[PDB]
């Protein structure tokens, strides 16, 4: 297959249409590793292939684009994904990132603390989340839909994502949420994308492409996670670093997508059509103001 | 009194100490302008491009950037490092200076002192 030369593999549509039961995820390539280029961290390669895949979708890319990055820190104290996003997004793009623990970043602003404490006045054109809590991978207990930061994410998407904006939210076999799968039905398109560098993991990015603010199709999150696990169980993906060696077309093209501040009665079917095609962002174009709530105690 | 961390890191290195790790190296074509501090990776055949924040000693050590106003040259940018020095990008950025005429490192790309 050409798949080894792609940045990763996206869930095929026929799998999205099934009604599988949730099964334990057992990957044939489990334990294999991709040969990363010399000196390259796994998360730089992972974010790179994520952005290479995003280059194939109809993302709205306005002027003064607004991107927020949750789960941006690491145990290294640095933010590799934020650096890749910085490299990928057009110059002048506002990049805010956040994490629970402190880290040093290249983002324009960084908030430290639980994501539940993060509040912003404005809306966003692109949301990226790599938030993950290792305590969720418990093979000895039932794999229920998880809440925690996922709850925040769903709220944050419905209140603070611009119409036509896009999201990419990291999930695993156990780090997932049913309402997030349901929310994917409020986008013009959605997928689960697996990077070729990390194809031995149940990890994928839930990508919602072009937010519509209302359900387009009805998605059962439990069934859809079952479908994703069935896909990953039955389609071994070949680990590959190949796409990392061609960075010649990596930058996100600055499309100058129109931004309009419309009220809700104004969103006719033609506006919906423009949103669906990556040609319109609906949000106010004011100042970007963010904050992190601080709990005081003794 | 003022903590002088650049000096302490230079002496730490001279004492045979292990350089600061986890500087974030980027993927790039390595056909860039080779300038020192850029808004996107600009490594040439002879450089690696790193995220600036991870290569600044003050950012990495959680201490004040040494200037009034406290601004940081590297954070939010990308720093090109000669591949022969990529083992220690923080030490390199500390030990060297950028030409203000051409954007290149003095002694590592700058040729403004040529005939
Ligand atoms: C896989 S690491 C992300 C690594 C990072 N994206 C990188 O570039 O290397 C997952 C991160 O999510 C963060 N996290 C988990 N739960 C969180 C929460 N509820 N609020 C904020 N951050 C959270 C953890 O602190 C951890 O740093
Ligand atoms: Zn700094
Ligand atoms: Zn010069």
Numbering used by the authors:
A (entry chain A): 1 to 298
B (entry chain B): 19 to 133
Tell me, in the authors' exact words, what the paper reports.
Coronavirus is a group of enveloped positive-sensed RNA viruses that replicate in host cell cytoplasm via a large membrane-associated RNA replication/transcription machinery comprising at least sixteen virus-encoded non-structural proteins (nsp1 to nsp16). Among these, nsp10 and nsp16 form a protein complex, which functions to catalyze the methylation of the penultimate nucleotide of the viral RNA cap at the ribose 2′-O position. Such methylation process would convert the RNA cap of the virus from a cap-0 structure (featured as 7MeGpppA…) into a cap-1 structure (featured as 7MeGpppA2′-O-Me…) to mimic cellular mRNAs and thereby to prevent recognition of viral RNAs by host innate immunity. Overall, the nsp10/nsp16 structure can be viewed as an nsp16 monomer perching on top of an nsp10 molecule.
We also crystallized nsp10/nsp16 without additional SAM and solved its structure at 2.8 Å resolution. In each case, the solved structure contains a single 1:1 bound nsp10/nsp16 hetero-complex in the crystallographic asymmetric unit. In addition, the electron densities for the SAM molecule were clearly observed in both structures, demonstrating that the protein had captured SAM simultaneously when expressed in E. coli. As expected, the two structures solved in this study are quite similar to each other, showing a root mean square deviation (RMSD) of ~0.2 Å for 115 equivalent nsp10 Cαs and of ~0.2 Å for 298 nsp16 Cαs, respectively. The ITC data further showed that SIN binds to SARS-CoV-2 nsp10/nsp16 (13.1 ± 1.8 μM and 13.7 ± 2.3 μM to the co-expression and refolded proteins, respectively) with an over three-fold lower affinity than SAM (4.1 ± 0.4 μM and 3.6 ± 0.3 μM to the co-expression and refolded proteins, respectively). It is also notable that the stoichiometry calculated with the protein purified directly from E. coli were ~0.35 for SAM and ~0.3 for SIN, indicating that about 2/3 of the SAM-binding pockets were pre-occupied during expression. Within nsp16, an SAM-binding pocket is constituted by amino acids N43, Y47, G71, G81, D99, N101, C115, and D130. These residues and the neighboring water molecules form a hydrogen-bond network to trap the bound SAM in an extended conformation. Within nsp16, a putative RNA-substrate binding groove is lined on one side by the αf/αZ interloop and on the other by the η3-loop. The fact that we have been able to trap the cap-binding groove in a post-RNA binding conformation without the bound RNA-cap substrate further suggests that the proposed conformational change is unlikely a substrate-binding induced event but rather the result of the intrinsic plasticity of the RNA-binding groove.
